[PDB]
Coordinates of C-alpha atoms in Angstrom, one line a residue:
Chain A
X1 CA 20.8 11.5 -5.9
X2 CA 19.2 10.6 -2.5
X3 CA 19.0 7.1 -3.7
X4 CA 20.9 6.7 -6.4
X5 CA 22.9 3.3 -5.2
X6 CA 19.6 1.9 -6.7
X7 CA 19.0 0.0 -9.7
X8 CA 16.2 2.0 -11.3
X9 CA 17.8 5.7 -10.0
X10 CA 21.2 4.4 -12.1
X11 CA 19.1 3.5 -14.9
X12 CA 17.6 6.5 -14.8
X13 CA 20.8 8.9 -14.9
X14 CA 22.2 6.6 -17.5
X15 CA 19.3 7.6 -19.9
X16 CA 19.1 11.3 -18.9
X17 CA 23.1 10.7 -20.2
X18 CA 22.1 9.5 -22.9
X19 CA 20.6 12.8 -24.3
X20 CA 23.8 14.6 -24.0
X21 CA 23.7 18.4 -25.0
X22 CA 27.2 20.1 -25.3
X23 CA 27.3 24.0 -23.6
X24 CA 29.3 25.5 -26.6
X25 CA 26.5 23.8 -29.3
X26 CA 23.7 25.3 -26.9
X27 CA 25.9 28.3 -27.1
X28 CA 26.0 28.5 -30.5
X29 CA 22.3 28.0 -31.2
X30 CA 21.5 30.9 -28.5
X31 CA 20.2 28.5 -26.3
X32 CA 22.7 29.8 -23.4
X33 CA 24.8 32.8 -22.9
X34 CA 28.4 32.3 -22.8
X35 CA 29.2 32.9 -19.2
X36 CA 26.1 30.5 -19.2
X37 CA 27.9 27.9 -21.5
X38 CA 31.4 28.5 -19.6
X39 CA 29.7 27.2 -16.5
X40 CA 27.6 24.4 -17.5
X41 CA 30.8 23.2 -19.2
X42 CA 32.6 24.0 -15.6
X43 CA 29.4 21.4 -13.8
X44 CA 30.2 19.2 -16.5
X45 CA 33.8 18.5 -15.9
X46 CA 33.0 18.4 -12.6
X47 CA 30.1 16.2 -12.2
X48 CA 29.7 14.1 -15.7
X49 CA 33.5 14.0 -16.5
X50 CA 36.1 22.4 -11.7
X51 CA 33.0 23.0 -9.5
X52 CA 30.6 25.2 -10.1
X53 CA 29.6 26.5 -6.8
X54 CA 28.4 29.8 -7.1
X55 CA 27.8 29.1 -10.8
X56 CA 25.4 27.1 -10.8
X57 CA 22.7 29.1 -11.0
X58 CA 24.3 30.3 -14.8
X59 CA 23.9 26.9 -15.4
X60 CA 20.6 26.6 -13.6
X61 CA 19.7 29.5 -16.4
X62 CA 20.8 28.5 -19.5
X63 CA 18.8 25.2 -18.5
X64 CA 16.0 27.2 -18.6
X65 CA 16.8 29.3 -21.5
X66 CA 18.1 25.8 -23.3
X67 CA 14.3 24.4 -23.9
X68 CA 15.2 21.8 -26.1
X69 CA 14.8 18.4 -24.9
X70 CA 18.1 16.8 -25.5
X71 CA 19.8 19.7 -23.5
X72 CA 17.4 19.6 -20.5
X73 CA 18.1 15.9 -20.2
X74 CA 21.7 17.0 -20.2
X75 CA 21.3 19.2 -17.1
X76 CA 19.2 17.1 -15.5
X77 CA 22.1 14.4 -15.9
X78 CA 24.6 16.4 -15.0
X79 CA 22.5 17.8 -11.6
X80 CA 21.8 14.1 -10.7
X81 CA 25.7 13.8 -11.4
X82 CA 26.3 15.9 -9.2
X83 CA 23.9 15.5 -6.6
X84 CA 25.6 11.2 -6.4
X85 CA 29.3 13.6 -5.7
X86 CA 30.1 14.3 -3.0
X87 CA 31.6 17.7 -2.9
X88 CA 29.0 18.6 -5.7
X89 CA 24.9 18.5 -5.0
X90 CA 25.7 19.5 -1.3
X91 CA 27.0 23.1 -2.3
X92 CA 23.6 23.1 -4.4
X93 CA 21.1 21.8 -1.6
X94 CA 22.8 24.6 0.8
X95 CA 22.0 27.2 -1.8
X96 CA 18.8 26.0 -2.3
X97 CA 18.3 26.4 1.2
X98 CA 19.5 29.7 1.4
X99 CA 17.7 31.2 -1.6
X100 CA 14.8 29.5 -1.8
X101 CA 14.4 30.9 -5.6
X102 CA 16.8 28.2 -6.5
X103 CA 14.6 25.0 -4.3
X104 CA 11.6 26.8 -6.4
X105 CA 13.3 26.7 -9.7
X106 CA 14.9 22.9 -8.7
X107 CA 11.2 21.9 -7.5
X108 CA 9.6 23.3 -10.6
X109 CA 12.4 21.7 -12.6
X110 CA 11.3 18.2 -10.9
X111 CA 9.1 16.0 -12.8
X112 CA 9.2 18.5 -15.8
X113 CA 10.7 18.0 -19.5
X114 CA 11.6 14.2 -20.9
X115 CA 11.1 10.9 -18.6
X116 CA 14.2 10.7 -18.2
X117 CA 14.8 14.5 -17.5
X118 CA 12.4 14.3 -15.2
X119 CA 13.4 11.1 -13.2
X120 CA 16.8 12.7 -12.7
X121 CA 15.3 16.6 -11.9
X122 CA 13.2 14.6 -9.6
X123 CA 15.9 12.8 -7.8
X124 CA 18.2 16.1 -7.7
X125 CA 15.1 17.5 -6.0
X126 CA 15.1 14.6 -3.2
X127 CA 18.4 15.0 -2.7
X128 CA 18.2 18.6 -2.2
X129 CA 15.5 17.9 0.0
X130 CA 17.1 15.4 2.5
X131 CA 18.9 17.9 3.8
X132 CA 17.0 19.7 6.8
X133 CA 18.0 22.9 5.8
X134 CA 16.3 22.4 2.6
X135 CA 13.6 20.4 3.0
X136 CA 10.2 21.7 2.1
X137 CA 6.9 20.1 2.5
X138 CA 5.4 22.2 0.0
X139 CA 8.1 21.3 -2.7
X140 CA 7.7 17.7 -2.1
X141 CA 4.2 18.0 -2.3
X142 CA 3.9 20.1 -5.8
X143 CA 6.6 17.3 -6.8
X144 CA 4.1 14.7 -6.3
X145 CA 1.1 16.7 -7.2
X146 CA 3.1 17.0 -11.1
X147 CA 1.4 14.5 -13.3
X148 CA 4.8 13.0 -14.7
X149 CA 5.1 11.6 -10.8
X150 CA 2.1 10.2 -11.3
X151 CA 2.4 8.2 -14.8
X152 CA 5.9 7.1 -13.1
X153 CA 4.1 5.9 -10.6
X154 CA 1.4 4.3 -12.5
X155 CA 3.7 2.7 -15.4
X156 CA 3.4 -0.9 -14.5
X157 CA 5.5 -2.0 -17.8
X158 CA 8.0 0.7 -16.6
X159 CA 9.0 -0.9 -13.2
X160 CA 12.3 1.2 -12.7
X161 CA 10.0 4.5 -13.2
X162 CA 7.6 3.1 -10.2
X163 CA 10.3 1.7 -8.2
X164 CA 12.6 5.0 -8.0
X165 CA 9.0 6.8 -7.4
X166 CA 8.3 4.7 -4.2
X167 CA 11.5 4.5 -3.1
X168 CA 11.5 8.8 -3.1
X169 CA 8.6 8.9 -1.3
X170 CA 9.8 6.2 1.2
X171 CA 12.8 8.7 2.2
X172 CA 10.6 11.7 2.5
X173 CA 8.2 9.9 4.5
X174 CA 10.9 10.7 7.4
X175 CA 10.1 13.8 7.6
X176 CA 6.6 14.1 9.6
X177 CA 5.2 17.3 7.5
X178 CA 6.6 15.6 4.2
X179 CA 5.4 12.1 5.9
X180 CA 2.0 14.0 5.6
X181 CA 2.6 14.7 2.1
X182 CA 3.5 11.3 0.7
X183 CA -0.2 10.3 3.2
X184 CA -1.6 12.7 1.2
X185 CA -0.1 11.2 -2.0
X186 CA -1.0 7.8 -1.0
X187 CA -4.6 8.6 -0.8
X188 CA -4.5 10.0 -4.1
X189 CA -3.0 7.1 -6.0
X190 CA -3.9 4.0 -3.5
X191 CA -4.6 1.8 -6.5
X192 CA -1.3 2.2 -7.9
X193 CA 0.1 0.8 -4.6
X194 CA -3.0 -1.9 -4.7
X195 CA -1.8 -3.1 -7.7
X196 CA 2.0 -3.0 -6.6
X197 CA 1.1 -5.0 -3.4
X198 CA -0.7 -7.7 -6.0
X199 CA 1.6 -7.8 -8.3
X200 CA 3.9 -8.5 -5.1
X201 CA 2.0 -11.5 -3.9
X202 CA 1.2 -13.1 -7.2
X203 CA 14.9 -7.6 -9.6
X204 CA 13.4 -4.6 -10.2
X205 CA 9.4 -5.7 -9.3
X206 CA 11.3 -6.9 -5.8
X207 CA 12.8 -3.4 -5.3
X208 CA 9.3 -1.7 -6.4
X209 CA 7.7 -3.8 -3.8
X210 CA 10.5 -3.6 -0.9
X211 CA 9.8 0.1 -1.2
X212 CA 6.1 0.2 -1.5
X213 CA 6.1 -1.9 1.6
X214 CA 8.7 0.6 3.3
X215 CA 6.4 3.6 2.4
X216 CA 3.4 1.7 3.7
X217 CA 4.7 0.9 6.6
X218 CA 6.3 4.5 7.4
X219 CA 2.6 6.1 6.3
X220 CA 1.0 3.4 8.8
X221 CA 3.6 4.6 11.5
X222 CA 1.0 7.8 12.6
X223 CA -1.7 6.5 14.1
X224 CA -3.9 8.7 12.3
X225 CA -3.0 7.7 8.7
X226 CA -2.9 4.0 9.5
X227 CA -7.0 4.1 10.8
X228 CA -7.6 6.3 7.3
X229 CA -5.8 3.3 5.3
X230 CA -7.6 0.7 7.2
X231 CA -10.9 1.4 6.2
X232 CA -9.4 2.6 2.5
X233 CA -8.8 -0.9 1.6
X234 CA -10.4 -4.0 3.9
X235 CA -8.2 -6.1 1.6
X236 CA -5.5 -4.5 1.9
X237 CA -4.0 -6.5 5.1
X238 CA -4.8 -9.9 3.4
X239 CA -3.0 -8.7 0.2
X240 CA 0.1 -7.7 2.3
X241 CA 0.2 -11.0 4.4
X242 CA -0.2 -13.4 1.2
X243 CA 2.7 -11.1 -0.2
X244 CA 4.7 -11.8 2.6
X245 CA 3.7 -15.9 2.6
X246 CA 4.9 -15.6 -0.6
X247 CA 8.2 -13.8 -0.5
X248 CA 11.2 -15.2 0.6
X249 CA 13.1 -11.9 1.2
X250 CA 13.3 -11.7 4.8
X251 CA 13.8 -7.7 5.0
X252 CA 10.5 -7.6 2.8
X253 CA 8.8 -10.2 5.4
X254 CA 9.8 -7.8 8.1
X255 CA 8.5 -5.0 6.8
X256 CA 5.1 -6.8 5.8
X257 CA 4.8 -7.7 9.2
X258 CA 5.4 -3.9 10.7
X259 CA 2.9 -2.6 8.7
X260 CA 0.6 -5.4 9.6
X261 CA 1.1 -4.9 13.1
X262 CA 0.9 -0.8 12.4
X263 CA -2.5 -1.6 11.2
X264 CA -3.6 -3.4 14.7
X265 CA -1.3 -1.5 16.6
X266 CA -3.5 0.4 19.8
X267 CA -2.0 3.8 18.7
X268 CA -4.2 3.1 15.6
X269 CA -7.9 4.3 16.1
X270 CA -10.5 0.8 16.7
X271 CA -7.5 -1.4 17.2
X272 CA -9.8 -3.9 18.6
X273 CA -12.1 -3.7 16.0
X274 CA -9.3 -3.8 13.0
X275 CA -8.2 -6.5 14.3
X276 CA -10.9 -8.4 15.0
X277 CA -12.2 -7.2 11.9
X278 CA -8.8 -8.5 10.0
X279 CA -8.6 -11.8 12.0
X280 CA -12.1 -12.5 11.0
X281 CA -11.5 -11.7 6.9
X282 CA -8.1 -12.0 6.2
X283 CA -7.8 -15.4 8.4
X284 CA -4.8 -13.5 10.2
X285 CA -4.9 -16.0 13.2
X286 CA -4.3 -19.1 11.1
X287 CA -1.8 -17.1 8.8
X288 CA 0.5 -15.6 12.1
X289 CA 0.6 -19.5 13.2
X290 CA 2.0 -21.1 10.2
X291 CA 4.6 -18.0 10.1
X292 CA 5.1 -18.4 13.8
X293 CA 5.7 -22.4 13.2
X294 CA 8.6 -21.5 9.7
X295 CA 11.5 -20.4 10.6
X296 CA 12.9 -17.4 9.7
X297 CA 16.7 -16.1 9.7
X298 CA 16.1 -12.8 10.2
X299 CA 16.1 -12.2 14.3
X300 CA 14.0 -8.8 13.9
X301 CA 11.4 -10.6 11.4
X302 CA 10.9 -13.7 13.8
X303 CA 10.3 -11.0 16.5
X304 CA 7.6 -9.3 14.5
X305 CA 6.1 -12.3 13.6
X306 CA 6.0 -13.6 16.8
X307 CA 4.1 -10.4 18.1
X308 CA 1.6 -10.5 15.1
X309 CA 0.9 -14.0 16.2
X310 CA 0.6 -13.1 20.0
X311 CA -1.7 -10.2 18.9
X312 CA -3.9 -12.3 16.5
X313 CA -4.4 -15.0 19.2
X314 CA -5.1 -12.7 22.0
X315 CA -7.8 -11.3 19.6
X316 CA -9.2 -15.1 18.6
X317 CA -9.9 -15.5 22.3
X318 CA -12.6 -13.3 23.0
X319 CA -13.3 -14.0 19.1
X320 CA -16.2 -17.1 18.7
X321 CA -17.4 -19.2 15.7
X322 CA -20.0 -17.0 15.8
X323 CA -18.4 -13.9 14.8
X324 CA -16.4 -15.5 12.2
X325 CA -19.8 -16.7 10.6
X326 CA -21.1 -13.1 10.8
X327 CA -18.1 -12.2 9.2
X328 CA -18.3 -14.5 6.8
X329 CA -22.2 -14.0 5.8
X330 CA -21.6 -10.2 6.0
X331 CA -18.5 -10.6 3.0
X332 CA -20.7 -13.1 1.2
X333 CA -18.0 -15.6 0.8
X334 CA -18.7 -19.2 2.1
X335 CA -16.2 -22.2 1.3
X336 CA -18.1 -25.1 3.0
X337 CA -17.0 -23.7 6.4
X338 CA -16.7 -26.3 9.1
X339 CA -19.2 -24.4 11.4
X340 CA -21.5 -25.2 8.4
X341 CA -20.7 -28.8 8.6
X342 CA -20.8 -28.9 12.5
X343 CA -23.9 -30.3 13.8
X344 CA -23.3 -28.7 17.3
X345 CA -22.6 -25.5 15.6
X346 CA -25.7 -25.5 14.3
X347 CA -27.7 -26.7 17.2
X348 CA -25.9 -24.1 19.5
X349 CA -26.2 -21.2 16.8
X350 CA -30.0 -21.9 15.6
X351 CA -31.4 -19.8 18.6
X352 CA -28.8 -17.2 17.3
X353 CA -30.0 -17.4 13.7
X354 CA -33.6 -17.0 14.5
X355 CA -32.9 -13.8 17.0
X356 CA -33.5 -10.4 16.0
X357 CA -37.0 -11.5 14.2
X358 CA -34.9 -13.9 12.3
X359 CA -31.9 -11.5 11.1
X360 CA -29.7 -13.6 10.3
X361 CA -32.1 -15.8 8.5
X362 CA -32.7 -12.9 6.5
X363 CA -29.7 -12.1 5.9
X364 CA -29.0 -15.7 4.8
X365 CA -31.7 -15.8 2.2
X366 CA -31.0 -12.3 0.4
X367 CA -27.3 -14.0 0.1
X368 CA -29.1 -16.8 -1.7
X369 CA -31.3 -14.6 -3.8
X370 CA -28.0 -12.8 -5.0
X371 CA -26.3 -16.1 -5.5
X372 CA -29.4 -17.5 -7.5
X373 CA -28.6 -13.9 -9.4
X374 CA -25.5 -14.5 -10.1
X375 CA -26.3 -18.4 -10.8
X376 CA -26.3 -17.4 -14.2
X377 CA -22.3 -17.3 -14.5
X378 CA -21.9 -20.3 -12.2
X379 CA -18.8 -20.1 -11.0
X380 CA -17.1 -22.3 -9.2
X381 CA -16.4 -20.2 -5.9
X382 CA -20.3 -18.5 -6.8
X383 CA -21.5 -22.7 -7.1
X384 CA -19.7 -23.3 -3.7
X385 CA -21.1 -20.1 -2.4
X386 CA -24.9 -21.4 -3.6
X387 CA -24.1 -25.3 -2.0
X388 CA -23.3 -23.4 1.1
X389 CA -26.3 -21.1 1.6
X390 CA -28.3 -24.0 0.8
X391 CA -26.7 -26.1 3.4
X392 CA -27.5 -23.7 6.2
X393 CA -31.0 -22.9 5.0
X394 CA -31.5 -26.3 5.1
X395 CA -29.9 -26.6 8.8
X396 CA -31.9 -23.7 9.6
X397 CA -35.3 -24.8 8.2
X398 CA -34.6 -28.2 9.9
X399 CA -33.8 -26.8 13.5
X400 CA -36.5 -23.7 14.7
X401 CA -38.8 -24.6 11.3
X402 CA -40.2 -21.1 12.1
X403 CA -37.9 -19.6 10.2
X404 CA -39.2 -21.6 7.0
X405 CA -42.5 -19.5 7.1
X406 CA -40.0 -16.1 6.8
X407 CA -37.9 -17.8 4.4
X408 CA -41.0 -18.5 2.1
X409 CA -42.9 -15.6 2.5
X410 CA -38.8 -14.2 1.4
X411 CA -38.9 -16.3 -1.6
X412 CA -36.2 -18.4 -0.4
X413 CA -38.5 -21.7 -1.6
X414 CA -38.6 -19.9 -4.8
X415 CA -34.7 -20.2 -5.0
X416 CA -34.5 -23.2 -4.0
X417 CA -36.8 -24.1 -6.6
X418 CA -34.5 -22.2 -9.3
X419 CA -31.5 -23.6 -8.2
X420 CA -32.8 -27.2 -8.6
X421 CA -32.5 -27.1 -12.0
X422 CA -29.0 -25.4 -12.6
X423 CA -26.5 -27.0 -14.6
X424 CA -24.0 -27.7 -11.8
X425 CA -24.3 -31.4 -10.4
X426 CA -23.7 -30.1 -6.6
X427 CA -26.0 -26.9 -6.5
X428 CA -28.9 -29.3 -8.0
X429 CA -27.9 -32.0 -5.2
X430 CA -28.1 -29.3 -2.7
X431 CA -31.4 -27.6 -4.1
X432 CA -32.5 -31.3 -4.2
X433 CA -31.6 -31.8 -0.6
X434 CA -32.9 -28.7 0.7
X435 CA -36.8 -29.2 -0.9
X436 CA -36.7 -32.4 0.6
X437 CA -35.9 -31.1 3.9
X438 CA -38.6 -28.3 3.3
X439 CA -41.6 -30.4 2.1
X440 CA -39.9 -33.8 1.4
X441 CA -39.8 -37.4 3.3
Chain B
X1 CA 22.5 -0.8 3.8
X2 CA 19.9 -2.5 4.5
X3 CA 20.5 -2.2 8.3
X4 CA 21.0 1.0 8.0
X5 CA 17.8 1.3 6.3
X6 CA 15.8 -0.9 8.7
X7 CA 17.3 1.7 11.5
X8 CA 15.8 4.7 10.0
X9 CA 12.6 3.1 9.7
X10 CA 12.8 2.0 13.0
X11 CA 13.8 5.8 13.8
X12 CA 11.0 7.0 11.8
X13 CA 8.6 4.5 14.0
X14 CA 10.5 5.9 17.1
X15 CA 9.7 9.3 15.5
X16 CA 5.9 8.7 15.3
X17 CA 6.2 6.6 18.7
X18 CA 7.5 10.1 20.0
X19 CA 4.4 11.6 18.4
X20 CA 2.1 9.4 20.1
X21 CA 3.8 9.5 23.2
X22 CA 3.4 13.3 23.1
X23 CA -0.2 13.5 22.4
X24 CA -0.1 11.2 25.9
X25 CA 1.5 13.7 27.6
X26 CA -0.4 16.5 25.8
X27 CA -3.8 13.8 27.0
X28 CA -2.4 15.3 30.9
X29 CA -2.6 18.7 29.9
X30 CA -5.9 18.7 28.7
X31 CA -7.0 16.8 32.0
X32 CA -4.9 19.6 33.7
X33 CA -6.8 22.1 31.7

């Protein structure tokens, strides 16, 4: 196979194995013809353990004509066999390149019959397909398009299925048309790589997510494909840098970084913007400076990290408190931010707040509203949320008071009023604190 | 190997650097147009 020095690929050929099918005994029950059974017994000695060559597509026929599960796993076994040898596989890739009925009849094989079958047809396929001579864009692509790709991809309990799915599509992502494919395929199933990447940051997992990362990173490498996955998942950058916090792998780092970096990268369309935009969400700046300040073996990794951090501080600098607060009200997510606890903050940012016929204010008090909504689950990170919102409405009803009138005509008094008797201790201190500022000595 | 596997990444970046680098050069031709 193309990658069968892996973990999962070996597992995978040991189970198509497994299912064993003798030629003669598929002979016997008609399931092959005996110059059929003559040469699948030939690719057997040769590959499974006297080539085939030019007899492989016998074989290639009584696979077909053999429909029975135990001897398609067989031939899939014994193609993967022979793809890992090699003076076998490379006589079969040539003649799939030069009769392209046999890629079609390997393709359509791919990803068809038993899991295992299909793991090892599939990896034949890739194989088959690494060559240039007989690579195909459109086979990789009805590969992917099969829906046994896509369980394999999707089986979280089956890691080695996932794993030997990513890493397939992470070697032909070198090829730009099949690079194009496996784009296309990561647009279809981006929560199955979502869920790899959390599963990541939260062995055969570590291989699934080294080559998750790697096809990431080589699907971020047009510029083109890296703006489409920017704006796929927002998340997706802050998911990828506390995966690589949390790993200790350093080629895993590396490549968490590249793609981090592909992300911002100018070829990418609204580099500025993504990276303001990620530097503002994903605290990027703070992140690239505790990575910048560990040390890390790897020379290529400290390299990368170093430019992520360069980038991300070059961004902070035309970046203010004031964007990160827009940010910050614009997500809906507020932690006690020390711009919320800054008096001068405030007092420089009140003018700001009350601009736009009170925009922010506005937008400050519908945040409340939906807090007070979802008061009834009180959570702590929705309680922190509330103290928060009721901090600044309380800054902002004690600096430019004119915004109280908008607030009150918005209900915001209303909430406040709500939120003073929730069960949480802090909201009601803050509800407390806030009507006191409003109408209170 | 992993090195070797890093390279054709890198390679693959190279490849799509290329890309980019073309559709700079292809940016003259449409000014030359």
């Amino acid at each position: 196979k193309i990658l069968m020095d892996s973990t999962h690929f070996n597992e995978i050929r040991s189970i198509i194995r497994s299912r064993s099918v003798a030629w003669d005994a598929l002979a016997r029950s008609e399931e092959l013809s005996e110059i059929d059974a003559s040469t699948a017994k030939a690719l057997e000695s040769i590959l499974v353990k006297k080539v085939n060559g030019k007899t492989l597509i016998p074989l290639i026929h009584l696979l077909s004509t053999s429909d029975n599960e135990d001897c398609k796993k067989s031939v899939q076994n014994l193609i993967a066999e022979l793809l890992s040898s090699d003076k076998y596989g490379d006589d079969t890739v040539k003649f799939f390149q030069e009769d392209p009925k046999q890629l079609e009849q390997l393709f359509d094989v791919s990803l068809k019959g038993d899991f295992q079958t299909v793991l090892i047809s599939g990896f034949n396929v890739v194989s088959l397909l690494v060559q240039n001579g007989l690579h195909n864009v459109k086979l990789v692509e009805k590969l992917l398009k099969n829906n046994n790709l896509i369980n394999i991809l999707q089986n979280i309990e089956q890691m080695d299925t996932c794993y030997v799915c990513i890493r397939l599509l992470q070697e032909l992502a070198v090829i730009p048309e099949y690079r194009d494919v496996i784009w296309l395929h990561e647009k279809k199933f981006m929560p199955t790589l979502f869920k790899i990447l959390q599963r990541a940051t939260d062995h055969l997992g570590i291989q699934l997510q080294y080559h998750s990362l790697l096809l990431i990173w080589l699907l971020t490498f047009n510029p083109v494909f890296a703006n489409e996955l920017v704006q796929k998942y927002l998340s997706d950058f802050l998911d990828l840098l506390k995966l690589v916090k949390i790993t200790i792998k350093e080629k895993v780092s590396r490549l968490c970084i590249s793609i981090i970096l592909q992300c911002c990268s100018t070829r990418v369309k609204q580099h500025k913007k993504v990276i303001k935009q990620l530097l503002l969400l994903g605290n990027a700046l703070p992140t690239v400076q505790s990575l910048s300040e560990r040390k890390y073996s790897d020379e290529e990794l400290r390299q990368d990290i170093s430019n992520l951090k360069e980038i991300l501080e070059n961004e902070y600098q035309e970046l203010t408190s004031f964007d990160e607060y827009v940010a910050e009200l614009d997500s809906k997510l507020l932690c006690w931010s020390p711009p919320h606890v800054d008096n001068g903050f405030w007092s420089d940012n009140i003018d700001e707040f009350k601009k736009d016929n009170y925009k922010i204010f506005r937008q400050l008090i519908e945040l409340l509203q939906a807090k007070v909504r979802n008061g009834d689950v009180n959570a702590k990170q929705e309680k922190i949320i509330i103290q928060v919102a009721l901090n600044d409405i309380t800054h902002v009803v004690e600096l430019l008071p004119e915004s109280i009138d908008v607030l009150d005509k918005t209900g915001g008094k209303a909430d406040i009023m709500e939120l003073l008797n929730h069960s949480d201790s802090r909201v009601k201190y803050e509800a407390l604190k806030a009507t006191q500022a409003i109408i209170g000595y | 190997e992993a090195e070797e596997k890093a390279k054709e990444i890198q390679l693959k970046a190279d490849q799509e650097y290329e890309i980019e680098k073309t559709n700079i050069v292809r940016n003259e031709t449409n000014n030359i147009d």
